[PDB]
Design an enzyme around this catalytic site. Structure first.
Site, short mmCIF file in Angstrom:
data_model
loop_
_atom_site.label_atom_id
_atom_site.label_comp_id
_atom_site.label_asym_id
_atom_site.label_seq_id
_atom_site.Cartn_x
_atom_site.Cartn_y
_atom_site.Cartn_z
N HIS D 50 30.76 36.82 28.40
CA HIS D 50 29.52 37.07 29.10
C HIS D 50 28.88 38.39 28.68
O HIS D 50 28.92 39.38 29.43
CB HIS D 50 29.79 37.05 30.62
CG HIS D 50 28.56 37.07 31.47
ND1 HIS D 50 27.75 38.18 31.59
CD2 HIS D 50 28.01 36.12 32.26
CE1 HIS D 50 26.76 37.91 32.42
NE2 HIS D 50 26.89 36.67 32.84
N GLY D 59 26.12 39.37 37.34
CA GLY D 59 25.43 39.72 38.56
C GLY D 59 26.21 39.29 39.78
O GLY D 59 26.30 40.04 40.76
N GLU D 64 30.00 40.70 44.41
CA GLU D 64 31.39 40.69 44.83
C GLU D 64 31.89 42.12 45.08
O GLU D 64 32.60 42.37 46.05
CB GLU D 64 32.24 40.00 43.76
CG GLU D 64 33.73 39.89 44.06
CD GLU D 64 34.02 39.08 45.30
OE1 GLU D 64 33.24 38.15 45.57
OE2 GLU D 64 35.02 39.36 45.99
CL LIG Z 1 24.43 37.86 35.00
#
Ligand SMILES: [Cl-]
Ligand SMILES: O=C(N/N=C/c1cc(Br)c(O)c(Br)c1O)c1cccc(Br)c1
Ligand SMILES: O=C(N/N=C/c1cc(Br)c(O)c(Br)c1O)c1cccc(Br)c1
Ligand SMILES: [Cl-]
Ligand SMILES: [Cl-]
Ligand SMILES: [Cl-]
Ligand SMILES: [Cl-]
Ligand SMILES: [Cl-]
Lengths: 151, 151, 149, 151, 150, 150
Positions: D50, D59, D64
Site C-alpha cells: 500500500h 487512511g 484505527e
Molecule cells: Cl488510504
C-alpha cells in the site's frame, strides 16, 4: 553445470519467499538425479507456529523441498539453464506417494534432498528419493509434478 | 554441558524471532570460548530486502549473532544452564570494535561463531573472534557487554 | 539537493523491506556529510523478538541505518540523483569500528543519523558519526563501505 | 500520569503486532482529552502492499490509531492505570462518522492523534478529533466506542 | 460480471497485506457491486487483533468496502482495462455513517454490497453493507475521487 | 455441533502460519470429520506461490487434512479436553495416495473430509478428500502420531 547457487535457483524456479525451499544444488545429472539442500534455521517464519517452543520443520514442507528439487532437475533437463524460458513457467503437484517421516527436522539441520527420476514424459515428471540430515534418512517420498506455461 | 540445541538456546537467550540468530552450540568452555552456528537459508525474511535478487546475509547481523554467542557464553559461565536465572538477567552490549568483513555470507552457508573471552572484569565481559563458513574466516569482531539484573 | 524522501531513497539505495532503515534525508553535503533519520515504531516485525514485552531497536541495526545513510551520500556525491546508475550497484560493509551504544532506542523515537566522510576514494567510503534521539547521542560509529556492481 | 510510553500502552491496550498503532502518549486529561502519536517508517509490513513503490499509510489505519487512543483515554479515565483490570476489558467501535482524509501520511511522518471526549456515559464513549503531521490536519473523524468484557 | 483474484490484481494497485478483496461475484456499471473476502486464521493481522481472540478489524472491513467500491467506480467508466488502470488512482476522500453490528471471525465469508449513491465526474459516492451468511455485520458510506496516477 | 477457531486453538498445538483449519462443521468420534479453511489472498504464503499467480500449496492442503484428522484424533481419544491437549504435539508419519485435481485459489472455501481408517494408541491413519464447492479438489491418506511435548 553440476552445482548451482541461490542466484541460479531464483532464475529457474518460480517459487519465492516463503515457498522457495532449496538453497543450493550440489549435484545434477540431466534426466537422472539431483542432490540439493536447504538450511534449517530458527529464523524462519514457519517455526512461529510449528510449534510454539518446539521448532519442528513441517513434514509437508520437506516434501515440497524435494518436489522443488525435482522441478529444477526437470526444467534444466528440458531446456537447460534458460532463465528466460523459466521466467514464464510454474510447477503443479500432480500426485504424492509413499512418504515416511523417520526423524524430525529442526533448526541447525542441513536438509539434503536426494532425488532421482522414476519416469518422465514431456512436462510430467515422476520423482522419488529422500531427505537426509547428517547422512541419515530423515524422510522418503515419491511425487509426480508438472511443468506448465503460465497463462 | 557442551552441546546445546535450539530448545536450550531458547531457555537462556531472551531473543526471539526474527532476532534470535544462533541455531546451535557445538561447544563451550566456561570463561574461555564458544563455538556455535546459525544456518543461513533463503527462507528468511531479511533476504526480501537485502537484497532483491542477490541474497546476502547482513554484515551487522553476523556481528549480532556473534554478540549473541558471547552473551550465551558469559551467562553460562556465571550460572551455567539455568533458565530460571536467565529470565532475570540482561546483557547490554556496550561496544563493538575492529569488525572486518572479508567474505559475503549467503543462503546455504553454515555461519559458525567463534568467540573467546578477552577480558572479564566484574559485570563487564569482553569477547572477540570470527564468524566462519567452511573453515574460512568471513568476518571478525571484538565486543564488550555488561551483565545486569533484568527489569 | 539537500532533502530527500522515501520516494527518492527507494531509487538510490538497493535495500528494501525489512532492511531499508532510512526514511528521510534532511541535510546532505556532497562528499562531506549527511543528516537523515528512521522513525521507530512498535509496528515493525523486529520488535516481535527484540524483545517480548520490552521493545528495543537493535544496536546493530542502528549501525546499519548509519551505513545506509553513508551510502546514500557516497553515491549521490559521485553520480547525483541517478536512479538508472544507482540500480547498477549495491553497497556492502567492509569494516565497522569504535561503535558505542549509550542510550537504548525505543518505539516513538526519531533515530537521527549524523555521518561525515572521514576519507573516501573511488567506491571506497569511510564515514563516522552518531545516532541521535531528541538531541542526545544514543550511539557512535565509524564504518567503511564499498560501492560495487 | 499524563505521559505514557510503549511499555505503558502495552499494559493497557490488548492490541499487538501488527495492530497496535500507538507508540506514545504525550498528553492525557481524564474524561477530556488525549494526545498520542505513531511513528511512520518504511519498515512496516503494510507498505509492502500500500502501495508498491508509493508508500502511503492506510487512511483506515489512521482512524484505527485515533480509535485506540480514544480507547486508552476511555479506559484510563475510568480505572486509571490499572493493568490487571485492563486485561479484562476490551474496546470495540460501534460507529465512525465524519471521517475525512486530507493529506497522505508517509514514511518519516510522525502521525499525531488528537482526540477529545464528546460524550461519555458509563462504558459508552464518543470521541472526535484529528490525526496531525507537523501541525497540519491530515485526517479527522468521530467514533463512539464501547468498553466490553474480554469475556 | 464475475472477476477472480487475478483480474482484481490487474485493476487494483493494492498488494499483500492490503488487498482485501478476493472475488467479485456480480457487477453492474454505475449501479452496484457484490464482492467478498475470505477470513481465515492464517492472516498476519490476527497475531495482534487479538491474541487468543481473533477478530477481523472493523476498519479493514471498511477498507474492503472501499476497494470494492473503488473497483465498481473504475470498471464502470473504463471496464476491465488493466492498462488504463495503471494511469488512474482511486483514493477516498470521506467515509461516513460507519456502523459495526456483528464481529467477523476466521471461517466467515465477508461479502461486500456497495451501491453507487451519487457520482459526478471523477467523484463517486458509494454506500452499502458488509455481510456474512446473509446478515449485516457492518455498513458504511464512502466518497472517492478518481485521479491520474503517474 | 460446530467448533470455531478458539475451540480449535484449544486442541491443536499448531499456530500462525501453520494452523490451517478454521472451523469444524461436523464431527463423529472414531469415524469421520468435516472441516474447512478459507483461502484468501491475504495470506503470506501467496507471495511466493506463485508471484502473479496465487495457488494454495498442494502440500498445505494435505497439511490441512492432517490437522483435521488431528482434531478428530484428540477428541476421539480424550474428548474436548484443552488441558490434556496443551501438552501434546502431532507428528506426520506417512502420506500416501494423494492426488490434486483442481487448483485452490483465493476465494475458495477449502473443505476437509476425513474418515478413520485405522487407529491404535497415538497412531492414527485417516483418509479422505479436500473439496471446493462440492467438487473433489484433492484426495489423500495419512498416518500421524500424537506425542507428549515431554
Ligand atoms: Cl488510504
Ligand atoms: O537490551 C537488552 N539486552 N539484552 C538482554 C540480554 C539478556 C541475556 Br541473558 C543475554 O544473554 C543477552 Br545476549 C541479552 O542481550 C534487554 C534489556 C532488558 C530486557 C531484555 Br528481555 C533485554
Ligand atoms: O494519494 C493518495 N492515495 N493514493 C495515491 C496514489 C497511489 C498510487 Br499506487 C500511485 O501510483 C499514486 Br501516483 C498515488 O498518488 C491519497 C491518500 C490519502 C489521502 C489523500 Br488526500 C490522497
Ligand atoms: Cl510435521
Ligand atoms: Cl552487508
Ligand atoms: Cl541491542
Ligand atoms: Cl474492531
Ligand atoms: Cl501445488
Amino acid at each position: 553445470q553440476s552445482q548451482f547457487f541461490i542466484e541460479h535457483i531464483l532464475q529457474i524456479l518460480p517459487h519465492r519467499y516463503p515457498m522457495l525451499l532449496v538453497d543450493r544444488i550440489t549435484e545434477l545429472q540431466a534426466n537422472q538425479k539431483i542432490v540439493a539442500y536447504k538450511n534449517i534455521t530458527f529464523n524462519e517464519d514457519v517455526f512461529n507456529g510449528h510449534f510454539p517452543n518446539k521448532p519442528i520443520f513441517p513434514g509437508v514442507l520437506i516434501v515440497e523441498g524435494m518436489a522443488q528439487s525435482g522441478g529444477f532437475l526437470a526444467f534444466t533437463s528440458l531446456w537447460g539453464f534458460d532463465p528466460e524460458i523459466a521466467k514464464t513457467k510454474i510447477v503443479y503437484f500432480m500426485t504424492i506417494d509413499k512418504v515416511k517421516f523417520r526423524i524430525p527436522v529442526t533448526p541447525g539441520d542441513r536438509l539434503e534432498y536426494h532425488l532421482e527420476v522414476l519416469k518422465h514424459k514431456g512436462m510430467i515428471w515422476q520423482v522419488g528419493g529422500t531427505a537426509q540430515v547428517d547422512g541419515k534418512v530423515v524422510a522418503e517420498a515419491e511425487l509426480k509434478a508438472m511443468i506448465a506455461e503460465r497463462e
